[PDB]
Amino acid sequence: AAAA
Amino acid sequence: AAAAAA
Amino acid sequence: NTSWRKSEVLAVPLQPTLQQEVILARMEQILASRALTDDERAQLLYERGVLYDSLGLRALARNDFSQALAIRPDMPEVFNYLGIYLTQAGNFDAAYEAFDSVLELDPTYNYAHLNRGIALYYGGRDKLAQDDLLAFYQDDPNDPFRSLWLYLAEQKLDEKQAKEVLKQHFEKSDKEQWGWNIVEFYLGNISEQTLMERLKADATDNTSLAEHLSETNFYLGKYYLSLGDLDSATALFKLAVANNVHNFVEHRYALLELSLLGQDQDDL
Amino acid sequence: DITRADQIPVLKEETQHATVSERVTSRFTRSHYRQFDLDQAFSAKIFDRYLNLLDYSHNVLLASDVEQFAKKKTELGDELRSGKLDVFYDLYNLAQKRRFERYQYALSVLEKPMDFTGNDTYNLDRSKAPWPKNEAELNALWDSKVKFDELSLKLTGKTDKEIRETLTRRYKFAIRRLAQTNSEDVFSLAMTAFAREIDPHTNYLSPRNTEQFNTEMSLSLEGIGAVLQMDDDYTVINSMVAGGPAAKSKAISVGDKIVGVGQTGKPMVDVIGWRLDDVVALIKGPKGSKVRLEILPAGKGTKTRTVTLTRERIRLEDRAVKMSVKTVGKEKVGVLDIPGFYVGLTDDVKVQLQKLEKQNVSSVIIDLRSNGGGALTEAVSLSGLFIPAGPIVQVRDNNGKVREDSDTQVFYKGPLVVLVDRFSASASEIFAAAMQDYGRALVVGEPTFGAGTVQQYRSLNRIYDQMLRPEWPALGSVQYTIQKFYRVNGGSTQRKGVTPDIIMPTGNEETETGEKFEDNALPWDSIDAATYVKSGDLTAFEPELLKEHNARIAKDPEFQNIMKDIARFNAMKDKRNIVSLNYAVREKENNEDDATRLARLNERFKREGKPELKKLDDLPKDYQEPDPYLDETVNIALDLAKLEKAR
């Protein structure tokens, strides 16, 4: 879970 | 910057 | 009586030449004009910076150097001065970064080794200083100041070994340059008075005398300081600065030493 | 997809890595607070550290592998200076093949039908185990490993074909991950081996990591505001940040899949067969910039559509300070939950303090539990809100130069409480010590982490980098310790931490975490106290606060399973790293636990109204547990305000  | 963390 | 004053060796403190002032004036007008390309401007700015530095106007030199970088960020020569200023300011860490840039941009920029080596020494990283200093020495073994700087660094690690290394450098050398005389004094070969006599003999004119005094008094101060004679060291550093040889490293570092001595006093 | 050793790509150091290595090396070697020589001895330690990073559980490499490499273990220093990182790389590569070999072996073991009722055990700490002497040992360890895994799934209660199916997807996934490894993955690892050898708080951050750290520091990021998850080969959108570009567009939804990414004057790049980070990197960009996304909609349909979005600055509100009011009858107490000392925190607190005035809150609790720290300036400024003037902290370099940091007035003058735990560190400790040293606030919780150093964060980018190497990616960043920090006391929280005025029960138990357990942590020491004026004095109020607190926890039900939970925890620490491996016994322990777990909620309810109903609510909802430390703290806060009021 990474924010872009 | 100067950091005081973890 | 006061006949003693005769023993003092002093030059008239250096003053700006007419040509220096004339050039500065012309530079201002050119910079204020539309006659320069961006590349030319950067170059001129470096040139003014060098001139300002030569007159003891360091902050003004730094502004010029900074502006040059803003135009062209690939000037090793600019980074070199900035490192030197950072060292003078006691900001050794930043200074290291600057010297690296000089080398990265141009690995043949030999003086960076000397300057980074000097900064590391003031920074208390003697062995690392020694690597730069040894390399600087290799480039010109015949330059006595290269040996002196290396000795100062090495002395922190082992005084005995440093002396032997210095002696070898001296013996190994052509022995031509004036600076070797200072080295002989450090070595015990000659006395201080003899060193001074030789200095008087070597110098030709006032500028020559001032330069000799600037370098010599700085090294003498370091020598006395090393021995713990604080008052003698202090007088010598002031005496070095009095020559107004603004661009010599001996001059810059004498000022730094004075500043360190001052801080200590202010503590306790 | 991968079935052979030749499907494992040979990792190669990037073109810019050498330069980076050199840059990190210059910084670490010349400017670290710890003056070390990067000599042969140091180099060997780095090698040892790298191996542990490479194979934490001494499971993959053979002793012959280690020993082959140990022959060049003192060469690491020369490599870092040079930036030609062959041993780090050669070793990583060998580790890859070994990992693959291991996983492939595990694939076999799973097929062997074994369900077991023996008494054989598994140890979780293989940290110091000797390397496997031979293949037999390796297979045996892995035989042991696979057993542990299947057993754990079986403990959930599945079948055996499932467990095989579940584990199959796992070992296979692990194999895929290996084939997806980066040159960067290795370079980051090598730098970390080096950094950590120096001290526990020294790091190298890769370009992506640097970006992340900045975001955590600033509470903001530049891109489209979408949280991405990777399922198999597809980048799926998990959620959308409110007020962000993807969310505001109304052309993108949760569950949508991004199979294409397009830069403004370039083609749409298929990203199906990609690592998550490589994809996120394409998506993120400078605000005002445009990105076009090829989206495969959430259903079973095969049609794709292209969505174009304008990148923008997005704030992560979740990470910001949060304010709440706790009410106990007529009295109210405000609480500030501070996750970190992010830039701009003090400002954020000021507005919150302003709101609190309106509500006429009697006391304020500042919750630093689990607050790792952050910016030093933020620590100083936050302190300044509560303290009128003077030094907040003292800093000292390696050469004895001492400096004191202070603020510019007081924003809140009322009763204050700082809540801390074993995980509250650094800036959090600085603030807590200062409030305590000035007599400003009472400190409640567990003893601190023991952080006592200051790190310098510096980018490795040089101004002419773009000009001379446009093709290069961004370089990363480093954090390195430059100084030790001391309380105004002249005291130090290095190793010790700060001891709360009131300590929760978990507080008196031997901790297993902290600065003191980290590798190469600097020693505790002290300096002369600075000059400051005490804000107030709370030493008088302590016995009364103590007894009142003590009486309350004694009765409290929640504050009792904690006590009992503690002695019980004490009972099994010795056998803590060893798990049974017997299908029979775990369940006795396991259900013996679930049972214990599904019960004591009841004594609290009966004690109260009761709260809810469940003969056995064995299958509860998404449960939010209560927060007794905080609830008790609030009780302490009210006691404090009462006493202060009676002065």
C45, C62 contact by CB (below 8 A): no
- Residue C63, classified by CB atoms within 10 Å of its CB into exposed (0-12), middle (13-18) or buried (19+), is middle
Report the greatest alpha carbon distance in chain B.
15
Which residues in chain C have their CB less than 8 angstroms from residue D31's CB? Answer: 93, 96
Q: Where are the alpha helices (DSSP H) in D86-182?
A: 86-111, 135-154, 161-179
Tally Cβ neighbours within 10 Å of residue D277: 18
Contacting partners of chain B (3+ CB pairs under 8 A): D
- For chain A, the first-to-last Cα distance in angstroms comes to 10
Q: Whole-angstrom Cα distance, residue D368 to residue C91?
A: 35
Structure tokens at C133: 């200093």
What DSSP letter does each residue of D539-604 carry, written as one string? Answer: STTHHHHHHHHHHHHHH-SHHHHHHHHHHHHHHTSTTTTEE---TTHHHHHHHHHHHHHTTTHHHH
D284 SS3 class = coil
D228 backbone dihedrals φ, ψ, rounded to 5°:
-110, 135
For residue D90, the cross-strand partners are none
Question: Which amino acid is it at D584?
Answer: A
Q: Whole-angstrom Cα distance, residue C219 to residue C150?
A: 13
CA distance A2 to chain D (A): 5
Phi-psi region of D96 (alpha: psi -120 to 50; beta: other; left: phi over 0): alpha
Nearest CA to C118 out of C73, C70, C83 is that of C83
Contact assignment for D23 to C100 by CB distance below 8 Å: yes
D258 backbone dihedrals φ, ψ, rounded to 5°:
-105, 110
Contact assignment for D430 to B2 by CB distance below 8 Å: no
For residue D229, the cross-strand partners are D236
For residue D457, the cross-strand partners are D479
Q: Tell me, yes or no, if D226 comes closer than 8 A to chain A by beta carbon.
A: yes
β pairing state of D442-445 and D453-459 = unpaired
C123, C147 contact by CB (below 8 A): no
Q: Whole-angstrom Cα distance, residue D369 to residue D164?
A: 41
In sequence order, what are the residues at sequence separation of 6 or more whose Cβ sits closer than 8 angstroms to the Cβ of residue C130? C117, C150, C153, C154, C157
What DSSP letter does each residue of D513-549 carry, written as one string? Answer: -SGGGSTTPPPP----------S---STTHHHHHHHH
Nearest CA to D450 out of D389, D373, D352, D338 is that of D373
Q: Tell me, yes or no, if D277 comes closer than 8 A to chain A by beta carbon.
A: yes
Experimental method: X-ray
Which residues in chain A have their CB less than 8 angstroms from residue D262's CB? Answer: none
Domain boundaries of chain C, sorted by first residue:
1-268
Tally Cβ neighbours within 10 Å of residue D414: 17
C217, C248 contact by CB (below 8 A): no
Q: Whole-angstrom Cα distance, residue D460 to residue D457?
A: 10
The CATH class of the D319-537 domain is alpha beta
Q: Whole-angstrom Cα distance, residue C59 to residue D228?
A: 51
In sequence order, what are the residues at sequence separation of 6 or more whose Cβ sits closer than 8 angstroms to the Cβ of residue D415? D362, D363, D364, D637, D640, D641, D644
Sign of the CA dihedral D516, D522, D523, D526? negative
Residues within 8 A of C (CB atoms), D 450-509 only: 462-464, 467-468
D309, D249 contact by CB (below 8 A): yes
β pairing state of D416-420 and D363-367 = parallel
Q: Which of D23, D24, D26, D30 to mutate to test the interface with C (most CBs of C within 10 A)?
A: D30
Structure tokens at C156: 């922190």
Using CA atoms of D69, D72, D77, D82 in order, give the dihedral in degrees to the nearest 10: -90
Q: Whole-angstrom Cα distance, residue D390 to residue D408?
A: 9
Exposure string for D68-107, b = 16+ CB within 10 A, e = fewer = ebeebbbebbebbeebebebbbebbbbbbbbbbbbbebbe
Nearest CA to D207 out of D482, D468, D465 is that of D465
The CATH class of the C1-268 domain is mainly alpha
- Touching pair B, C by Cβ (3+ pairs < 8 Å): no
β pairing state of D363-367 and D373-375 = unpaired
β pairing state of D442-445 and A2-3 = unpaired
Q: Tell me, yes or no, if D280 comes closer than 8 A to chain A by beta carbon.
A: yes
In sequence order, what are the residues at sequence separation of 6 or more whose Cβ sits closer than 8 angstroms to the Cβ of residue D534? D438, D439
| Tokens 């580790």 belong to residue | D95
Contact assignment for D454 to B3 by CB distance below 8 Å: yes
Cis peptide preceding D401, ω within 30 of 0:
no
Q: Whole-angstrom Cα distance, residue C180 to residue C185?
A: 9
Q: Tell me, yes or no, if D399 comes closer than 8 A to chain C by beta carbon.
A: yes
- Residue C128, classified by CB atoms within 10 Å of its CB into exposed (0-12), middle (13-18) or buried (19+), is buried
Phi-psi region of D225 (alpha: psi -120 to 50; beta: other; left: phi over 0): left
What DSSP letter does each residue of D251-269 carry, written as one string? Answer: S--TT-EEEEEE-TTSPEE
Which residues in chain D have their CB less than 8 angstroms from residue C123's CB? Answer: 30
Q: Cα Rg for chain C, rounded, in angstroms?
A: 20
Contact assignment for A4 to D284 by CB distance below 8 Å: yes
Q: Whole-angstrom Cα distance, residue D183 to residue C239?
A: 58
Phi-psi region of C165 (alpha: psi -120 to 50; beta: other; left: phi over 0): alpha
What DSSP letter does each residue of D353-389 carry, written as one string? Answer: HHHHHHTT-SEEEEE-TT--EEEHHHHHHHHHHH--S
CA distance D335 to chain A (A): 29
Q: Whole-angstrom Cα distance, residue D215 to residue D223?
A: 12
β pairing state of D363-367 and D331-337 = parallel
Question: Which amino acid is it at D228?
Answer: L
Structure tokens at C41: 């401007």
Nearest CA to D630 out of D209, D337, D381, D360 is that of D337
Phi-psi region of D502 (alpha: psi -120 to 50; beta: other; left: phi over 0): beta
- Residue D488, classified by CB atoms within 10 Å of its CB into exposed (0-12), middle (13-18) or buried (19+), is buried
Question: Which amino acid is it at B4?
Answer: A
- Touching pair D, A by Cβ (3+ pairs < 8 Å): yes
CA distance D16 to chain C (A): 13
Q: Tell me, yes or no, if D227 comes closer than 8 A to chain A by beta carbon.
A: yes
In sequence order, what are the residues at sequence separation of 6 or more whose Cβ sits closer than 8 angstroms to the Cβ of residue C109? C76, C77, C80, C102, C103
In sequence order, what are the residues at sequence separation of 6 or more whose Cβ sits closer than 8 angstroms to the Cβ of residue D647? none
What DSSP letter does each residue of chain C carry, written as one string? Answer: --GGGGG---PPPP---HHHHHHHHHHHHHHHSS---HHHHHHHHHHHHHHHHHTT-HHHHHHHHHHHHHH-S--HHHHHHHHHHHHHTT-HHHHHHHHHHHHHH-TT-THHHHHHHHHHHHTT-HHHHHHHHHHHHHH-TT-HHHHHHHHHHHHHH-HHHHHHHHHHHHHHS---STTHHHHHHHHTSS-HHHHHHHHHHH--SHHHHHHHHHHHHHHHHHHHHHTT-HHHHHHHHHHHHTT--TT-HHHHHHHHHHHHHHHHHHH-
Structure tokens at D386: 């509560």
Contact assignment for D464 to C125 by CB distance below 8 Å: no
Which residues in chain C have their CB less than 8 angstroms from residue D462's CB? Answer: 101, 104
D629 SS3 class = helix
Contact assignment for D457 to B6 by CB distance below 8 Å: no
Which residues in chain A have their CB less than 8 angstroms from residue D221's CB? Answer: 3
* Closest chain D residue to the Cα of A1, Cα to Cα: D229
Nearest CA to D228 out of D183, D186, D282 is that of D282
CA distance D38 to chain C (A): 10
In sequence order, what are the residues at sequence separation of 6 or more whose Cβ sits closer than 8 angstroms to the Cβ of residue D321? D336, D337, D338, D339, D345, D348, D349, D352
Structure tokens at D269: 């790049």
Domain boundaries of chain D, sorted by first residue:
5-198, 220-315, 319-537, 546-645
Q: Tell me, yes or no, if D577 comes closer than 8 A to chain A by beta carbon.
A: no
Q: Whole-angstrom Cα distance, residue C178 to residue D240?
A: 75
Question: Which amino acid is it at D367?
Answer: D
D233, D179 contact by CB (below 8 A): no
| Tokens 């609790």 belong to residue | D365
Which residues in chain B have their CB less than 8 angstroms from residue D479's CB? Answer: 3
Q: Residue D442: in which H helix or E strand, if any?
A: strand D442-445
- Residue D531, classified by CB atoms within 10 Å of its CB into exposed (0-12), middle (13-18) or buried (19+), is exposed
**Do the domains spanning D220-315 and D319-537 agree at the CATH topology level?**
no
Nearest CA to C8 out of C223, C230, C239 is that of C239
Question: Which amino acid is it at D343?
Answer: V
Which residues in chain D have their CB less than 8 angstroms from residue B6's CB? Answer: 201, 372-373, 425-426, 451
Contact assignment for C73 to D463 by CB distance below 8 Å: yes
CATH topology for D220-315?
A: Pdz3 Domain (2.30.42)
Q: Whole-angstrom Cα distance, residue D116 to residue D122?
A: 13
Phi-psi region of C35 (alpha: psi -120 to 50; beta: other; left: phi over 0): alpha
A2 backbone dihedrals φ, ψ, rounded to 5°:
-125, 145
Report long-range pairs for C9-12 (Cβ below 8 Å, ≥24 apart). Answer: C9/C196, C9/C199, C9/C200, C9/C213, C10/C213, C10/C242, C11/C206, C11/C209, C11/C210, C11/C213, C11/C243, C12/C206, C12/C210
Nearest CA to C103 out of C250, C152, C95 is that of C95
D14 SS3 class = coil
Contact assignment for B3 to D451 by CB distance below 8 Å: no
Q: Residue D341: in which H helix or E strand, if any?
A: none
Which residues in chain C have their CB less than 8 angstroms from residue D464's CB? Answer: 73-74, 101, 105
Which residues in chain A have their CB less than 8 angstroms from residue D279's CB? Answer: 4
D76 SS3 class = helix
The angle at the Cα of C191, spanning C185 to C193, to the nearest 5 degrees, equals 115
Q: CA dist D625 to C161, D259, D503, D590, Å? A: 69, 40, 21, 21
